């Protein structure tokens, strides 16, 4: 009765698939952790709920995880692999290989002080990868809903990560849902209602990397002001030739008579572009809070590059933005 599928612990499926626990849940139905009598082995399976809005979104997952299995390429294993699907008891199910926790999950263990520079450095690579392998020509995708938790590690002591949930994803050109990208990973080209391209993944990458780093959302917006509000603290006021192509501009900013933008008033925010990302990552004062002074692998040229980095991936502009082949060069990678 209703979307949700009844799961039972200790049940079986098709003489198959062992349920042993519910491993996590979403909008689009839930994920349980099932052995796999046949081939010996644990499999994550995404239950999609009986709805055609969910039924919908799943079966374009399908379509883009298919379509990436096609290629021969090392770059593909940064994205969670479908083994195979089914329908069971009126239901999509997506059998995925079983990974560890998310990247959220991780910051929590470490109580929101933030993984080490040499760890951010390490999953920054690898989505990078990801990122260039989603631009691929034939592929073209746009992920559309990266967040901490669609990051997953593969092995909980391990460093190699895997993007998962396509669910929200499209092909370059398209325009499918109203409303795109989690409110704090949100590029300003969608807060904005401009077209968007590959570029916002790369926003989202940016963003992910800071909290990571100093354990909290760089952005974390209550509401689409004062995410737009959140992000002009930090990079200060747009560029005008953007703000006068874009269709929402009135939402956040006002055009004076000589021509430059500057914010609407509310109805408290440091002025635009103080709250500076030098100061954020705590460059030349021991990283997040002090708490990396001294520590090895946490010099202020480390810290330079990262900071550096950052910036070229929250480029306002998603036309000078920096893209994956370019960022996978940059110092910060440097061996
Ligand atoms: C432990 C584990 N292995 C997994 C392998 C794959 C997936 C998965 C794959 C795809 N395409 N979409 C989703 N939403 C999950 N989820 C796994 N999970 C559960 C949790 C940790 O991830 C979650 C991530 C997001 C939501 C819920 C759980
Ligand atoms: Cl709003």
Not at 101 to 118: A, C, E, K, P
Not at 127 to 133: H, R, S, V, Y
Not at 293 to 305: C, M, N, P, Q
Request: aromatic share 10%; with cysteine.
């Amino acid at each position: 009765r209703g979307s949700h599928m009844i799961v039972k612990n200790g049940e079986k499926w098709m003489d198959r698939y062992e349920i042993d626990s519910l491993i996590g849940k979403g909008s689009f139905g839930q994920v349980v952790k099932a052995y796999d009598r046949v081939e010996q082995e644990w499999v994550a399976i995404k239950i999609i709920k009986n709805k055609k809005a969910f039924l919908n979104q799943a079966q374009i997952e399908v379509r883009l995880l298919e379509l990436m299995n096609k290629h021969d390429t090392e770059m593909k294993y940064y994205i969670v692999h479908l083994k195979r699907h089914f329908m069971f008891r009126n239901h999509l199910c997506l059998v995925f290989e079983m990974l560890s926790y998310n990247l959220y999950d991780l910051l929590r263990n470490t109580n929101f002080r933030g993984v080490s520079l040499n760890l951010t450095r390490k999953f920054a690579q690898q989505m990078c990868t990801a990122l260039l392998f989603l631009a691929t020509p034939e592929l073209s995708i746009i992920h559309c809903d990266l967040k901490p938790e669609n990051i997953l590690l593969c092995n909980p002591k391990r460093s190699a990560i895997k993007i998962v949930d396509f669910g929200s994803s499209c092909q370059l050109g398209q325009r499918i849902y109203q409303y795109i990208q989690s409110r704090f990973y949100r590029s300003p080209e969608v807060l904005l209602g401009m077209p968007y391209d590959l570029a916002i993944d790369m926003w989202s990458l940016g963003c992910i990397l800071v909290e990571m780093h100093t354990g909290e959302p760089l952005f974390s917006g209550a509401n689409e002001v004062d995410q737009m509000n959140k992000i002009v603290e930090v990079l200060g006021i747009p560029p005008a030739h953007i703000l006068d192509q874009a269709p929402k501009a009135r939402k956040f900013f006002e055009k004076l008579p000589d021509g430059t933008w500057n914010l609407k008033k509310t109805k408290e925010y440091k002025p635009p572009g103080t709250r500076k990302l030098h100061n954020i990552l705590g460059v030349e004062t021991g990283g997040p809070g002090g708490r990396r002074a001294g520590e090895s692998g946490h010099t202020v040229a480390d810290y330079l590059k990262f900071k550096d980095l950052i910036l070229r991936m929250l480029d306002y502009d998603p036309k000078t933005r920096i893209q994956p082949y370019y960022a996978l060069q940059h110092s910060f990678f440097k061996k």
